[PDB]
Amino acid sequence: APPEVLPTLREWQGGQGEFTLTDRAGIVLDGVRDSRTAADARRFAGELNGKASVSQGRAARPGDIVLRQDPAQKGLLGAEGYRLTVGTRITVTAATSTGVFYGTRTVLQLLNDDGRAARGSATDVPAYRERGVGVCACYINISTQWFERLMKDMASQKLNQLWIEAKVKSDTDPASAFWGYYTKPQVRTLVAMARKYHIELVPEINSPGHMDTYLENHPELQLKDRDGVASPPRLDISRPEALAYYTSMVDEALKVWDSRYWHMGADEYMIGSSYPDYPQLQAAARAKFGASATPDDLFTDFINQVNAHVKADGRSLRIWNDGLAGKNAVVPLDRDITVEHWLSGGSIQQPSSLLAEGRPVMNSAYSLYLVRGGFTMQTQKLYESDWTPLRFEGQTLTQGAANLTGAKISLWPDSAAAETENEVETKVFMPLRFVAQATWGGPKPSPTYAGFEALARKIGHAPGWENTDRTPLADGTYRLTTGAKALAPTADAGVSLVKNSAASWALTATADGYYTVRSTESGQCLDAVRGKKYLGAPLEVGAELSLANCSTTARTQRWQLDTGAGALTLRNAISQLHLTERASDGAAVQTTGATRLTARAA
Numbered sequence: 001a002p003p004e005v006l007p008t009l010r011e012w013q014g015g016q017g018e019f020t021l022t023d024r025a026g027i028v029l030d031g032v033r034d035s036r037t038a039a040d041a042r043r044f045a046g047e048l049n050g051k052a053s054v055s056q057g058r059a060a061r062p063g064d065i066v067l068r069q070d071p072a073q074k075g076l077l078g079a080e081g082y083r084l085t086v087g088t089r090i091t092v093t094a095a096t097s098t099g100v101f102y103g104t105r106t107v108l109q110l111l112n113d114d115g116r117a118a119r120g121s122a123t124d125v126p127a128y129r130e131r132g133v134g135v136c137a138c139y140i141n142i143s144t145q146w147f148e149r150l151m152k153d154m155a156s157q158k159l160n161q162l163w164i165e166a167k168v169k170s171d172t173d174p175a176s177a178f179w180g181y182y183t184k185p186q187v188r189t190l191v192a193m194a195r196k197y198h199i200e201l202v203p204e205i206n207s208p209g210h211m212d213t214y215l216e217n218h219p220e221l222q223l224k225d226r227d228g229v230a231s232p233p234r235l236d237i238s239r240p241e242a243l244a245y246y247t248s249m250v251d252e253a254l255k256v257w258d259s260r261y262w263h264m265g266a267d268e269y270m271i272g273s274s275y276p277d278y279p280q281l282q283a284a285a286r287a288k289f290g291a292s293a294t295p296d297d298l299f300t301d302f303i304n305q306v307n308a309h310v311k312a313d314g315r316s317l318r319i320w321n322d323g324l325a326g327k328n329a330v331v332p333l334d335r336d337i338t339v340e341h342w343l344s345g346g347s348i349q350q351p352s353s354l355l356a357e358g359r360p361v362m363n364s365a366y367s368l369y370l371v372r373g374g375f376t377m378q379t380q381k382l383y384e385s386d387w388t389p390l391r392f393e394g395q396t397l398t399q400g401a402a403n404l405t406g407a408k409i410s411l412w413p414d415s416a417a418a419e420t421e422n423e424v425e426t427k428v429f430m431p432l433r434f435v436a437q438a439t440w441g442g443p444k445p446s447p448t449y450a451g452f453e454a455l456a457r458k459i460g461h462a463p464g465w466e467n468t469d470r471t472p473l474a475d476g477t478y479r480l481t482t483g484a485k486a487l488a489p490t491a492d493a494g495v496s497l498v499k500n501s502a503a504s505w506a507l508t509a510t511a512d513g514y515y516t517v518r519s520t521e522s523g524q525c526l527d528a529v530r531g532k533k534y535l536g537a538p539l540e541v542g543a544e545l546s547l548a549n550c551s552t553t554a555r556t557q558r559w560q561l562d563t564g565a566g567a568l569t570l571r572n573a574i575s576q577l578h579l580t581e582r583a584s585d586g587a588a589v590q591t592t593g594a595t596r597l598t599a600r601a602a
């Protein structure tokens with residue numbers, strides 16, 4: 001029988017007998033020297049969580065796990081595939097560091113229960129080259145700790161691509177640097193994680209619309225209608241300053257992400273009925289592309305100019321598909337632009353038509369979305385329907401195509417205060433295994449979804465997934481102090497740090513890894529409801545915290561306890577800002593710094 005591993009092996013030639021892992025076992029690297037494979041192999045020893053260790057100075061022998069990097073196997077194993085033999089040693093042979101790494105992901109699952117594995121062999125090569133999760137970390141901020149956990153689980157399931165839409169805190173354009181954002185050091189930590197776990201990051205700055213996270217303080221870059229009224233999320237692609245601004249931000253972002261791909265988004269610029277309100281678009285289209293040109297030609301030209309820009313720096317461009325609707329009769333989309341297909345309908349170009357242009361096409365179906373406060377993909381029905389990347393929105397291919405790159409699930413924060421990142425982490429568990437399985441492309445693991453879920457939950461998270469303590473305080477009543485000031489209810493539902501206050505708080509852990517923080521004196525819960533909102537979330541740095549009637553559904557009343565130096569800081573689950581004493585008046589406000597609080601039972 002094939003081993004019960006996920007994703008499944010493309011095949012399995014079973015024999016009788018078993019391999020048994022002992023304490024004296026070596027991990028032996030006896031192919032080409034590769035410092036990345038070696039570093040991976042040292043981490044792998046720890047992930048196995050027994051006493052096996054990397055050997056040096058000897059040949060492979062019975063009992064070893066052998067990791068053999070042989071570039072001459074590329075024609076059989078590709079860039080990511082490996083050969084696995086389980087006999088009286090385990091041998092993983094691959095052409096690349098990544099193929100060895102994926103072989104080790106299988107070995108972890110084979111040996112988890114009792115250190116024994118059934119004998120046999122497999123050539124295990126992925127069916128698709130892009131096997132993805134996408135996270136829109138926009139408006140809100142999604143913690144780097146959450147991303148590290150996701151990437152470990154992705155790697156454990158041989159997923160290899162992480163799309164991230166996020167805003168780098170900008171030195172190029174400081175007027176865009178309003179929360180949420182990632183600092184450049186934080187982005188570099190994500191880059192390092194992805195290198196460790198053999199994931200390719202694919203960053204996006206959406207354009208030329210959906211730019212309200214950049215253009216808020218740039219009224220001069222916002223598109224204006226016939227009457228001068230601004231469309232705040234949109235650049236005016238008829239003007240030279242649009243491209244100049246956009247490529248300046250791309251260039252800054254590529255310096256930190258250092259990715260091979262750039263995703264510019266390029267969703268539909270506006271509905272067709274809106275073009276008459278911006279007659280500069282048709283005018284510029286005609287000016288540049290002739291009497292027959294339409295605004296869609298201008299839009300596609302904008303994309304092709306970004307293409308030229310990023311190609312000059314050795315990168316490749318990707319876009320969404322929904323602005324490709326057969327209306328750009330003069331200016332075709334450059335055929336080396338990867339199209340990620342998520343939406344069908346109307347005259348939106350079909351996947352078959354895109355693939356016939358010879359360009360790369362990824363399946364990013366709507367049906368594989370997770371949305372805060374909204375749509376949840378139907379993992380069970382998809383599994384039962386034997387979903388593959390051939391199953392696009394609006395069109396099933398019956399024949400494969402080499403330029404179909406693969407597929408990804410996508411995690412969106414539309415109602416950003418409706419669900420916490422920890423809730424989303426729970427929700428994505430089975431989606432992740434589903435997409436890993438469908439894109440790696442081996443035999444279906446179980447005829448039933450129940451069997452697949454059971455297996456996936458038995459295998460569980462990657463080794464060492466946990467990277468935080470979610471419950472560092474016993475539930476109870478505490479004074480929360482900084483010097484001789486204690487957090488307390490103050491005027492007008494406010495909360496301040498108050499000298500010699502006796503005020504105390506009931507802290508109670510929640511199911512999703514946070515705490516509610518409830519006034520002993522008032523009975524009201526610590527909340528974030530004041531200041532500017534984006535997607536319903538209180539994202540204003542400097543906004544006052546306040547007290548409100550305790551509500552289980554108010555995710556803004558959930559607080560993460562970040563610990564350090566015998567103290568804690570309180571991070572709002574939704575805003576991801578920390579409780580901070582405001583110097584002028586002692587008010588508790590939310591900032592990207594923090595006030596350290598000592599918890600004293602009380």
Ligand SMILES: CC(=O)N[C@@H]1[C@@H](O[C@@H]2O[C@H](CO)[C@H](O)[C@H](O)[C@H]2O)[C@@H](O)[C@@H](CO)O[C@@H]1O
Nearest residue numbers: 136138206210267268342369371412413414
């Ligand atoms: C064009 C469109 O409707 N796209 C939808 C997604 O839009 C993204 O929304 C996020 C905010 O959550 C951000 O503004 C991105 O730039 C934007 O592309 C998104 O709403 C998803 C999920 O509902 O649906 C469409 O893909």
